[PDB]
Write an enzyme that holds these catalytic residues in place. Sequence first.
Site, PDB file in Angstrom:
ATOM      1  N   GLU E  97       0.853  -1.185   0.000  1.00 46.97           N
ATOM      2  CA  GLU E  97       0.000   0.000   0.000  1.00 46.97           C
ATOM      3  C   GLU E  97       0.897   1.245   0.000  1.00 46.97           C
ATOM      4  O   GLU E  97       0.731   2.159  -0.816  1.00 46.97           O
ATOM      5  CB  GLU E  97      -0.880   0.038   1.255  1.00 46.97           C
ATOM      6  N   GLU E 127      -3.890   4.916  -1.468  1.00 47.03           N
ATOM      7  CA  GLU E 127      -2.845   4.054  -0.950  1.00 47.03           C
ATOM      8  C   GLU E 127      -2.350   4.565   0.413  1.00 47.03           C
ATOM      9  O   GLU E 127      -1.812   3.788   1.211  1.00 47.03           O
ATOM     10  CB  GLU E 127      -1.706   3.894  -1.976  1.00 47.03           C
ATOM     11  N   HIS E 130      -4.981   3.110   2.634  1.00 46.73           N
ATOM     12  CA  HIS E 130      -4.727   1.685   2.798  1.00 46.73           C
ATOM     13  C   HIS E 130      -3.535   1.396   3.692  1.00 46.73           C
ATOM     14  O   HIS E 130      -3.553   0.432   4.456  1.00 46.73           O
ATOM     15  CB  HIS E 130      -4.559   1.027   1.429  1.00 46.73           C
ATOM     16  N   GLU E 192      -2.451  -5.642  -8.610  1.00 48.60           N
ATOM     17  CA  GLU E 192      -3.801  -5.465  -8.143  1.00 48.60           C
ATOM     18  C   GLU E 192      -4.827  -6.289  -8.919  1.00 48.60           C
ATOM     19  O   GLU E 192      -5.569  -7.063  -8.319  1.00 48.60           O
ATOM     20  CB  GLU E 192      -4.146  -3.972  -8.180  1.00 48.60           C
ATOM     21  N   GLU E 226     -10.549  -0.348  -4.830  1.00 51.59           N
ATOM     22  CA  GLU E 226      -9.790  -0.990  -5.896  1.00 51.59           C
ATOM     23  C   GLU E 226     -10.318  -0.844  -7.320  1.00 51.59           C
ATOM     24  O   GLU E 226      -9.542  -0.912  -8.270  1.00 51.59           O
ATOM     25  CB  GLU E 226      -9.561  -2.469  -5.563  1.00 51.59           C
ATOM     26  N   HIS E 229      -8.400   1.876  -9.097  1.00 55.64           N
ATOM     27  CA  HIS E 229      -7.017   1.550  -9.416  1.00 55.64           C
ATOM     28  C   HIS E 229      -6.956   0.633 -10.618  1.00 55.64           C
ATOM     29  O   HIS E 229      -6.008   0.678 -11.403  1.00 55.64           O
ATOM     30  CB  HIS E 229      -6.354   0.889  -8.214  1.00 55.64           C
TER      31      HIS E 229
HETATM   32 FE   LIG Z   1      -4.339  -0.366  -2.011  1.00 50.42          FE
HETATM   33 FE   LIG Z   2      -4.709  -0.346  -4.977  1.00 52.22          FE
END
Ligand SMILES: [Fe+3]
Ligand SMILES: [Fe+3]
Lengths: 166, 388, 388, 510, 510
Positions: E97, E127, E130, E192, E226, E229
């Site tokens: 992260e 991030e 996270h 990811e 997510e 991303h």
């Molecule tokens: Fe993440």
């Molecule tokens: Fe991510």
Amino acid sequence: KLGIHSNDTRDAWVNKIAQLNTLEKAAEMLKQFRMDHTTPFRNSYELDNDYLWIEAKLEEKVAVLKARAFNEVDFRHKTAFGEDAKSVLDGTVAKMNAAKDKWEAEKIHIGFRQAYKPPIMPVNYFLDGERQLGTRLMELRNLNYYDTPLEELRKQRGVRVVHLQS
Amino acid sequence: SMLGERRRGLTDPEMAAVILKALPEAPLDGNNKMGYFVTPRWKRLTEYEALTVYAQPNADWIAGGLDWGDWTQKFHGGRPSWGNETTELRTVDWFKHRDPLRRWHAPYVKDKAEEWRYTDRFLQGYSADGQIRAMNPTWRDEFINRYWGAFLFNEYGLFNAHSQGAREALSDVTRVSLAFWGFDKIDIAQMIQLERGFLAKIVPGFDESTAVPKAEWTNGEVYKSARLAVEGLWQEVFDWNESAFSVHAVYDALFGQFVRREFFQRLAPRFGDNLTPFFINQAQTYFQIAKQGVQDLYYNCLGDDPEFSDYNRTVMRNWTGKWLEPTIAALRDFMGLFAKLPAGTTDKEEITASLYRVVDDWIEDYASRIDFKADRDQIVKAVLAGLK
Amino acid sequence: SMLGERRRGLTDPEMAAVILKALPEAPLDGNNKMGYFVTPRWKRLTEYEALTVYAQPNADWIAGGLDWGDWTQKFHGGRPSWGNETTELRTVDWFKHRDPLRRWHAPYVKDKAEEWRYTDRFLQGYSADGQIRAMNPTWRDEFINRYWGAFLFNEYGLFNAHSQGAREALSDVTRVSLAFWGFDKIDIAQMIQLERGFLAKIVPGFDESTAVPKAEWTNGEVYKSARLAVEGLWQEVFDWNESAFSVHAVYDALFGQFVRREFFQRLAPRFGDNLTPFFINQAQTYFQIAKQGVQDLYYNCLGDDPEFSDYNRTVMRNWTGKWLEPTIAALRDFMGLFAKLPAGTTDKEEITASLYRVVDDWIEDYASRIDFKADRDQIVKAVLAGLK
Amino acid sequence: RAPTSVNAQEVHRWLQSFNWDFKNNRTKYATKYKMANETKEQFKLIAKEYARMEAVKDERQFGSLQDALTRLNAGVRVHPKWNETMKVVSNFLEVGEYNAIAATGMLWDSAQAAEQKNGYLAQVLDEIRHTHQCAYVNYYFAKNGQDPAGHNDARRTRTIGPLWKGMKRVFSDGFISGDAVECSLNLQLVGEACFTNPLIVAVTEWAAANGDEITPTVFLSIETDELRHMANGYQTVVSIANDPASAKYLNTDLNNAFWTQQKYFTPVLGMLFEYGSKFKVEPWVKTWDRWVYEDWGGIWIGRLGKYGVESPRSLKDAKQDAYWAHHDLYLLAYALWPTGFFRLALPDQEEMEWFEANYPGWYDHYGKIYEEWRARGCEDPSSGFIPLMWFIENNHPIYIDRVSQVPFCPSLAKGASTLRVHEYNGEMHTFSDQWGERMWLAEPERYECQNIFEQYEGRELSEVIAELHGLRSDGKTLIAQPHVRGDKLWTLDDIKRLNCVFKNPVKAFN
Amino acid sequence: RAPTSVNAQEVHRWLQSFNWDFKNNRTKYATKYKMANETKEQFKLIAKEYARMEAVKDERQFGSLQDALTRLNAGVRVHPKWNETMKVVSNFLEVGEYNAIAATGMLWDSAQAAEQKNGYLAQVLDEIRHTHQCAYVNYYFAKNGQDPAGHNDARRTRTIGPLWKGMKRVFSDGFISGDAVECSLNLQLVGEACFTNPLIVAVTEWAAANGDEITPTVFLSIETDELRHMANGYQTVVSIANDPASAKYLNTDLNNAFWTQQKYFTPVLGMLFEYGSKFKVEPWVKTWDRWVYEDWGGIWIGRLGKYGVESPRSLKDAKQDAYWAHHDLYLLAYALWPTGFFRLALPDQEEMEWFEANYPGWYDHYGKIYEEWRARGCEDPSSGFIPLMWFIENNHPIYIDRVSQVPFCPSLAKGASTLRVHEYNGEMHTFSDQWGERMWLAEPERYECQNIFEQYEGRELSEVIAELHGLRSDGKTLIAQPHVRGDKLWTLDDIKRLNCVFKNPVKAFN
Ligand SMILES: [Fe+3]
Ligand SMILES: [Fe+3]
Ligand SMILES: [Ca+2]
Ligand SMILES: [Ca+2]
Ligand SMILES: [Ca+2]
Ligand SMILES: [Fe+3]
Ligand SMILES: [Fe+3]
């Protein structure tokens, strides 16, 4: 004393460094250290476990001496060796663009780092170099990345094959 | 279905008993404090510090790191993932910095969220209350739409200046602070556009397109040197600290504070404009929030570093001199905007005194912290030359 | 202990097993929607309605009630806990009202809380940014501390006018809206004192004490008729609807909206005072919020009641006329305050335009709803007769 | 250029001076006391800080409810009996939270000192929050529970049964009808300090024992606000302590308020806890004694001594009537199960053992009766038996106290069995105790509440239920049930075939 | 004069125009590609609205954690093995992260189109969220769990063991060191899309099965971010597809990124799931195939076929080298247990059946070895035995891949058994596969990471553990343990008595 973060090798070098009290002597010693202990072309792996740490301590000393010896303009535009940073950067990018192959390119990029890495060249110019040199090096290296067989690639790299198990 | 198919160890009789049976009589260690080894900046370790400090996996060869060894994969050429070579500043420990507001992600988005929803309520009250009726038409269509609007590009540029720092910062605490300084700048740029879009809804004929303000920024005279400075700070600086420092402790502290506070915040009220000051209040709140952090990193941590204090001050003094000239030019060009105002709006004395407020605050809050010998009357006189 | 001594049925194997074994195979009724019998004001029943409508235990003898029979315990004398006899207004259903903002406790305190926290952040930026430097000392120590501070008692007075209604309202939806309208009034009053307390902290000789502003409210000329109307709306009215209607759809919509919006909000900026407008933005956001509720109750529900449309309008027109005079009187007196302003601040051409804004706004939002026919020129004329 | 701000305490310092003097600045409500206008409040709050501290509590709570608790299916894995009990506890408490709004609104009007008004006002808003919280509990169990009926419409289905009338007496009308101070005594001094404060906590205890993690999440949060109201109640006495009228009226209003409140909660709460659960926490007899005699009657009332407050004279009488009160009442509640908005269950073997162990004599009286009813088929549709028939057969009247609305049966009760009947201007009245009897004889006009037998007289049972919507979604099955299992649910027809017609039990004295 | 406002899409409509042209307006990082100047982003967010949507998620999450979950003692009621697994899972993911923060800042610098920069920016902020979320999981288990050690100092105790190195390769350096596009592939297109999205979900399942309700609460919240991303990764490929360089380098960088990620996660994720849990959810063998082969290598990747993207050429080798990978790895992790910051356990009887059942032949190889080690007393502190000795005694050297950092013992492995040892300019290098070998041969200066044997050479075991703070608060007992029971915990003295001294296995070659 043989520790990971603290040992005799590191203490010894801290002393040697404390005795560098001139910019020219200190800068010359940092470049020498880099030729002797960094990259896969280092002259020796004897300091493999402490060179990263020792090098940072050497850089600290060179930075401090350079800021005291240089006027403001030179601190921003000259290398610790008195060279014009822009000329060096351009001259080196010029060589990189004339590089015939990836093997010639890696030599230019790696050598550039060993000689001019920051406390020597001002970071602004240095990271501008990383940007340009790194681009060409990759372009040359990633072209037909898998065509050469491992048998032949080991020869080009010039390693000594010690053991193969399959 | 009713109970669902998935059985959970916490509530499933059979599984829970298996779990309970394997549990020890008491905890296997009584030190239940994550981050107990981190040196507290304040009386007791804060949640901010525990959740943040040492998150960055630096090795000891990068001042303050707790790991060991080289990175596992570096750039082609050999450049390390993170390294001392990405900045001129040196310190005994890159992890010493602390955001005085102790902002980790949760507290950060919580506050901005509150600001967002209240902003929404304010505008709906402002529009429903028809306060737009008392705003001077010229100030609205000329100065807010064109000149305040053009300023969004300045803030946008300063936001972008933080891109390399988000990648190169040498510690978690500096990276989080940096990321939040930049995010607040993009937010201000967007609030300037939001105001323009709101006016386009409550004022017939107002065009929210960014074409006019963008043309002012890219080709006008008032913001020419401002743009030249922003372009340099953003794309010509490859040192993440030179960027954060020069932006927040030089350019934005003088030019940004003058434009936001001494021009728009100061004069909008005179034209019946309570709308722009609403957004500028946010921008100023953010500016002061960022300043606290900027001061802790560059002055408390680096400028007062036990081993590199002298060095760091010499470098920052250098950066201040390098960036003060383009900043002065930016202010000098902006002086051209005073000639555009309706006669009698403000005079040379008010303009001069306001320049001095910005310069004096700057000397007190930043320049003096590194012993930069700033001559306030010399700086103001250089700027006033731009008055037409 | 680590496990504790109290066993919980959700996680304890033995207990949960017993619970699980007693559960049916599926819910015993598929109608899982609480308040399903409530008539939705909008497309689908909202959480606001489900959790509020019919909480009040009224019997059918109080229009809308779903219960039956008399109250279990009444007042000495025989007066019911709640009854039709506490207000002149009549309706087919007292539960028809709906707050357009759909505010139940949670959303209400969430919004005020965000405002409180942002308020704290703004004052911290303001003080750190030194913005007080550009404020007019006279306007401060004298129109903010004395005349704005005194207005606090006006808002405090309107706050208390809500007390009886918080006791006599004939439905949950009307009671919840009423409580919020009053709570917001006490908030405004406390924010006025907050600003004076803030000024006290940043302006070395400023006294926060309410002494000055209180004497001005209790013995001044500026607000005498103002205080006279308040004391009446508060303690001389025993009808909850008259109190609520006369306060929000008559007095504070005219006197209140003029003082807050057309005077301090319009003139404060002209004295380099963006602090006061920050708090007035709240009072106005609050005013327009309460407005949608007042309109929905007295106009949408009552004023247009399917059976008492005509009846209620008669009473409200009656109420409008009854309090329109004390309100117009409160304004006239306030006009005397312009004479205390430094020469050149404003002219009768402006004040006349602002008064027509308040009156025309009132006629558009309230007056025309119940059909009292008010003449804008006569009203503005009668008020304007208070300047030299 | 220091970062500076202003907190609640700094503004609150000047709040007491917010009010000013004028001719008609006085309460609009009749009262025998005079609240001093110099009275102060314990918490220095302003509207904005108040909102913030409550908003933070809302976060935790709703966050738990919407996320983790829903993922754990917390709304389902609850004992059936308890799912049913929460329909009564949450909704009945909701009304108390709701009337407390109007009550503190009236007290807000009563106070003269700005600070005392501010204390009450803070409660006006809290009670609004509590109304919505208790509503949310029913809403959540409706949305995610094993039986939504009742949880989903208690606001109208509660009007069918007799238990609701008495709830309105202690938590609705007792809170708002009468001297502002009498109301404050019913609500804050007795209701909240003696019952609700402990009750709310106890409810979370019984809830947890029975699989319920929803109620604790919501009720513990309500609990965090109760300190402010205790203080309000306490400050009420301090505000009238120096008025001579106090030494003459306070103790009588308090005793009436005490009797009023205990009259209902003593039966009811003990009933809901012990009979509306499977897993037990503590015998009600022990709980009652601690709450009423020690904590309240002793510690709390004592601190009010210096203000002329003495223990309610009706205290001893309350204790003698208490022991069997909750046990006596469940017989009536179950016997009249068709009039509820929840499903009831008879004690299982483990429970009867628990009742006997904790209440010697319980089995020979209640235990034997319950087994008699079950063997006869009171749980089965096809039996044609509803316990009310057993009361008629064995000539055991069920009366509704004219004052408290609490159901009572003299002839069968193991507890109090006194009964007073009177006629006055063509109307009969039945009383269950000497205190309520005096209340009526002295204030006739305050107590004219019609009882269920009076309103349902002559009506057939199934028609009252159908008329008042006592049905589940399918339009045929009753919300109320004599068991908590998923099969053999009673329908409107199973009741109709019984031909049960209501009669006014008082007419037998005619 | 109607209530009006402005939302995020209304402002975003003009975001693209925010960037302007100037000579030096270009990326500061080396790259073979050119990102399209007019690339757009999927989601139209602005700073303010992003904050609000993330703020709403936090309230639910922290509300559940601070309220209900704490009341349920959810921090304790988890199987011992899973409490240990979460020390590694949460802290190792934390670093991914974190580096993703610098990674997307580097992509933000790379994009020239304002909308693409804004897309990456949102991830920069996610991030950070996270990083703080993963930190909170360890923070919560340390504060409330059955064994805080490791959870409370992983940021420093993780530096002792070999598993950490490989983690920094795939989730640290792999995310930020190289061509920005190469980094995008490691992070978004592979990382990811292929591993983290399905991983995060799978962890919540394994967690719920083992009594952990803390992780699902935080990780399920992480998962909601997510989607964005994924779109950034996808957008990276679009932005560079119409560039000549693309056809020349895209599939090579993608193949390298795929092998990099796979090499570490194929054996590590499977190991943590099966060996670090009590209750099993699904055999890794099938999980992997559906993940890498079906979902990613088939569905996802084929969607990017229109941009020139092809399936990784090393996909086949990855699958063949995957079946026993994690089993081969746990033997090494357990044998090197004193180097970790968590407690490990030998498979119990029930588990060996599951393994054998799901991986025929498991018992004949690993099963027997584990039985021999417990016979040797590997769990007993007085045995004076550590599985590492067994490796020495039976001549099974353990090497460290110079490129991936993954530990491997080719002489005692059922999966890959390849080994390439090279000498170059005075340094020895050991590789376990033909892909990483090519990486090193072509890019020597990118892979100079010293392994634990190189760094620990000549050092006595207890000395390294003491130096890197691998002790519990009593300063005697090891954080790491060879069993998960509450008694008979190994101390620093027990390890010292072993007199284990490290040596670099490669020095045996001449
Ligand atoms: Fe993440
Ligand atoms: Fe991510
Ligand atoms: Ca002048
Ligand atoms: Ca008695
Ligand atoms: Ca050799
Ligand atoms: Fe309450
Ligand atoms: Fe209360």
